[PDB]
Amino acid sequence: AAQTNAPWGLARISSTSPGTSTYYYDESAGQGSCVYVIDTGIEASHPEFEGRAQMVKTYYYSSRDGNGHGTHCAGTVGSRTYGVAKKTQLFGVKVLDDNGSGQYSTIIAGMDFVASDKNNRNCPKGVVASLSLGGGYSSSVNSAAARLQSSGVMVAVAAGNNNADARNYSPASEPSVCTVGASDRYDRRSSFSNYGSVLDIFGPGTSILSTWIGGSTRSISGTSMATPHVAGLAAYLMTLGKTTAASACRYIADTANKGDLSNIPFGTVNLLAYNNYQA
């Protein structure tokens, strides 16, 4: 399949070269996979989700995305127009309040919830979790991601937006999950994108156009918006049977576009998410 005038980030993960505008992808589009978006929630009524999005857990007075961040990332995972896996199921876990903040205990509880709730769902092609959130280092937030990953969920986490080594950030620094950094439309590391040895892969993260609350669209920048690109790709590749949850991060790393990024610090991997789709 092909999406003309796709968001540049979509076009980038189907292209070896920057600056293209068409998103090429297998038509299976992540059907049969599930991606938990652990965030502010999802405006599941957004027409761009076509009923493929639903809230399954909130840790606040409402399950509504009164922020837009979670709807934005869910859009990059599986929205019709702005999404990588346009057929995947999206489940919303609202661990961030409508101001984008959230305590560690509640983010651990949401990760612990996904690891169980997945056994309640139909995801024959496997389960992915996109975590477009972060904070200071925590062994207990790290271990929760490791538990979610070990339970059989592909865990993609943002590296953080601190222009620093991600090893001081959580869940970013947890070794076993897929720590995702942000690139930009000219194949540079995003000015804010964290780096370091713990990073496994880079994704489009600067000026990402996706869904927003109120049925609108918005472009925002952040490693939080690169994560859903890799989550979506993970669901995509898992639906294709190319990988599994346990090895999806390694596979995306092996099949990435190597060495395409500028201002990648020494010791940080130079790998850009890439579906390697051949029409």
CA atoms lying within 13 Å on the CB side of residue 86: 17
Report how far residue 205's alpha carbon sits from residue 10's, in angstroms, rounded to the nearest whole number: 11
With CA atoms as reference, report the closest residue to 200 among 149, 236, 242.
149
In Å, how far are 137, 151, 224, 259 from 187, measured between CA atoms?
28, 34, 17, 10
Report how far residue 251's alpha carbon sits from residue 189's, in angstroms, rounded to the nearest whole number: 21
Q: Which domain holds residue 123?
A: 1-279
At 271, which CATH number?
3.40.50.200
Asked about 254 being catalytic, the answer comes back as no
Asked about 33 being catalytic, the answer comes back as no
The reply to whether 228 sits in an annotated binding site is no
The reply to whether 128 sits in an annotated binding site is no
Q: Which of 65, 97, 224, 229 is catalytic?
A: 224
91 within 8 A of 115, measured Cβ to Cβ: no
What one-character DSSP code corresponds to residue 262? B
Could you identify the residue written with the tokens 């876990």? 93
- Determined by electron diffraction
The reply to whether 124 sits in an annotated binding site is no
Q: Which of 39, 97, 184, 187 is catalytic?
A: 39
The reply to whether 260 sits in an annotated binding site is yes
* Helix intervals (H) in the chain: 8-12, 69-78, 104-117, 139-150, 223-239, 248-254
Q: Reduced to 3 DSSP states, what percent helix, strand and coil does the chain have, rounded to the nearest 5?
A: 25, 25, 50
Report how far residue 208's alpha carbon sits from residue 190's, in angstroms, rounded to the nearest whole number: 12
The tally of domains found in the chain comes to: 1
Report how far residue 51's alpha carbon sits from residue 241's, in angstroms, rounded to the nearest whole number: 24
Asked about 224 being catalytic, the answer comes back as yes
- Structure tokens of 156? 């993609």
The reply to whether 200 sits in an annotated binding site is yes
Q: Which of 69, 98, 151, 165 is catalytic?
A: 69
Q: What is the resolution of this structure in A?
A: 2.1
